[PDB]
Design a protein around this ligand. Structure first.
Ligand SMILES: [Cl-]
Ligand SMILES: [Cl-]
Ligand SMILES: [Cl-]
Ligand SMILES: [Cl-]
Ligand SMILES: [Cl-]
Ligand SMILES: [Cl-]
Ligand SMILES: [Cl-]
Ligand SMILES: [Cl-]
Ligand SMILES: [Cl-]
Ligand SMILES: [Cl-]
Ligand SMILES: [Cl-]
Ligand SMILES: [Cl-]
Ligand code: NA
Lengths: 399, 400
């Protein structure tokens, strides 16, 4: 009859549980996997539990109950549950392999305690995360019966780019991934840039820019005029991503003061990217190989959530740069009063995140001019989230 | 009573044919090295494959009793040379596999296929070979380090069986015991491709068709054809437009400039893992003893014959190489008159390369250096992947 599968996406911002369902896989047809329900776990990402793994159980309980409430009891024992953690957990592992392991063991312990078929709790690789997102979107776009779309994924901690290039090379064979799907072997370029998700990029920029001299203030063009937020230096330096900028600071804490200038914001962003070393034909940034761009792209996760916000304010690069520039210069009190339904944690970041997305796509990946139009921003296709989890489910269902 | 099987290892530098025999009991009966380069050099010369294979196949027919030839399987497994050719041209690689197949099938044995084996197979099979030969299967196992002309592999059982990149991971059961083995093959990091990466990286429009190179002896010369240098996928990343067709490498024998030039072909800047080998590839912490074979052995053996015929500290191996690199090419030839110059001319490079790969690549520094055992043969059978491949493909490996 119907079959179910649960995938937890343990990302750096939040954990999300996904329930998938599909016709039981008979010989007299084939049918599709689709997203049935999603739950967002209340709280931060799992890495924030490193020193309190005894609370992991409780942390996951509400969304796990949704799943036992939602999936019929007679279908539960045979339903797989998997948790994949991403860049937040890769950073925690860099800090301390043991913390990461103690986090993941408490997750297994919790998940194993449910009536579902535990399939594992792992930190997935950057290449897997990228490939699986490319699988999700091409599957949902029906492309697996011709050319495929590239996949751009942006999160809090990392960003991925995955596409089939014109020419397959040994330029950086650790950037290639070959796999078979519906009788076709595929060879994709895929890379995850750790620390270049939107939140880690902001920590890098702040660490880069903070002055010993400042008396505990950082004027910052990436936030609205009148915006103020106090930053703990210990938190700022509590990520591997800012290690290269660490300095002794004569203060424990500092206030960010918005100055709302898109152009200065752009310039300040460009500074956490290195373009000076490329041991290949051409590169993205930080000496990482990138093949020439090819085909159309789906951009999702924070690419979508941030772009769609700016689009709803109006779709060329020139038009999007204008909307962003104007929005950046709007005072923070005006911004909150104009978007009063939006969580201030997201609203406070849109200037920064929009300018960052534009820098990443245009300077990082070279989607300039002609190429800008080859990017399609997407959240759901056929009602399933674009993301890695559906492709993970497809492959874990031996599809 | 006797049973035989044949495996041709079609590597980048040579094809080697091995006859195995048996009733840990399988044994190499004889090896034959096929004269000439690797099969991928026959890409436009596929009519010549038959003649190329003839001597070693004739050997095999002379050695195995005719009474036994028909139940004797024959396999060819080709490695990183043919992986590169498949990249350069899937067509060519396929015509070579076709020409090899036709030829092998003309012999009176059980023909069982010619195929390009994967990097993981190549690695796992090497590790199986050395532990089967060492009787570590009847316990701790040895790690395997393999170096050829075109790729290098590192395979071992890590302390933690949950690897950070399960793409580097294999899980299997051998003779009663469950194993999780880390394995990785680094294409283009065999000793010959590494030299071409380095020369392609170092040649400049300003070179005026002369490249002074510290990894070759004073007085040594070698002509490098540009279109050949750029005919490997391994140099594509360094290609540039050059106003000459060929250039001459002129040795200046300086170990430490050699070492530095070498380091420049590895990327060590980004590692999203706890630790890496190079080029962002995960490597677990090293553990236990390792056997280092193929070109690790033949190169190292030449050097330890300068070190009281024993691999000594990294410090002493380094010093030995350093001294050796300085010696003029006439002197080096005069001091080793029995050694083929094609090998002799490459020892300063290959030795410096192997030390960098092991010490900075695979992180065998300090304390860990002592646990590498360089070995050619174990109990009269070659360390390599071919015996492990044979054992599995004849399902002669039990789970209990
Ligand atoms: Cl996290
Ligand atoms: Cl992320
Ligand atoms: Cl983050
Ligand atoms: Cl390219
Ligand atoms: Cl609103
Ligand atoms: Cl709020
Ligand atoms: Cl070859
Ligand atoms: Cl090789
Ligand atoms: Cl080679
Ligand atoms: Cl000389
Ligand atoms: Cl000699
Ligand atoms: Cl000679
Ligand atoms: Na290393």
């Amino acid at each position: 009859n119907v079959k179910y599968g649960i995938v937890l996406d343990a990302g750096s911002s939040h954990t999300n549980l996904y329930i998938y369902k599909w016709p039981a896989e008979k010989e007299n047809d084939t049918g599709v996997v689709q997203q049935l329900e999603e739950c967002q776990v209340k709280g931060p990402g799992i890495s924030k539990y490193a020193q309190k793994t005894d609370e992991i159980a409780a942390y996951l309980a509400e969304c796990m109950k949704m799943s036992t409430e939602r999936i019929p009891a007679s279908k539960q024992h045979q339903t797989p549950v998997y948790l994949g953690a991403t860049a937040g957990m890769r950073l925690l592992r860099m800090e301390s392999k043991q913390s990461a392991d103690e986090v993941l063991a408490a997750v297994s312990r919790s998940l194993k305690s449910y009536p579902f078929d535990f399939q594992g709790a792992k930190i997935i690789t950057g290449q897997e995360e990228g490939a699986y997102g490319w699988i999700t979107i091409n599957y949902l776009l029906g492309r697996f019966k011709g050319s495929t779309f590239g996949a751009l994924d942006l999160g809090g901690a990392s960003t991925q780019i995955t596409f089939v290039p014109l020419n397959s090379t040994l330029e950086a064979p650790e950037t290639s991934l070959q796999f078979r799907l519906y009788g076709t072997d595929y060879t994709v370029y895929t890379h995850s840039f750790l620390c270049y998700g939107k939140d880690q990029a902001l920590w890098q920029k702040l660490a880069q820019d903070i002055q010993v001299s400042s008396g505990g203030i950082l004027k910052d063009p990436c936030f609205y005029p009148g915006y103020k937020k106090v930053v703990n230096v210990s938190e700022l330096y509590g990520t591997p991503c800012t290690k290269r900028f660490e300095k002794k600071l004569p203060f424990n804490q500092f206030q960010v003061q918005g100055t709302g200038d898109y152009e200065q914001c752009h310039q300040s962003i460009l500074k956490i990217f290195n373009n000076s070393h490329c041991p290949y034909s051409q590169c993205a940034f930080n000496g990482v190989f990138l093949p020439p761009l090819q085909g159309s792209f789906g951009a999702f996760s924070a690419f979508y959530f941030v772009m769609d916000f700016f689009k709803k304010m109006a779709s060329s690069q020139e038009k999007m740069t204008e909307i962003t520039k104007n929005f950046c210069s709007k005072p923070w009190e005006e911004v909150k009063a104009s978007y009063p339904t939006v969580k201030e944690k997201y609203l406070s970041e849109y200037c920064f995140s929009g300018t960052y997305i534009l820098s990443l796509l245009l300077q990082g990946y070279n989607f300039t001019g002609t190429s800008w139009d080859q990017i399609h921003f997407m959240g759901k296709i056929k009602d399933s989230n674009a993301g890695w989890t559906l492709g993970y489910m497809l492959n874990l269902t031996n599809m």
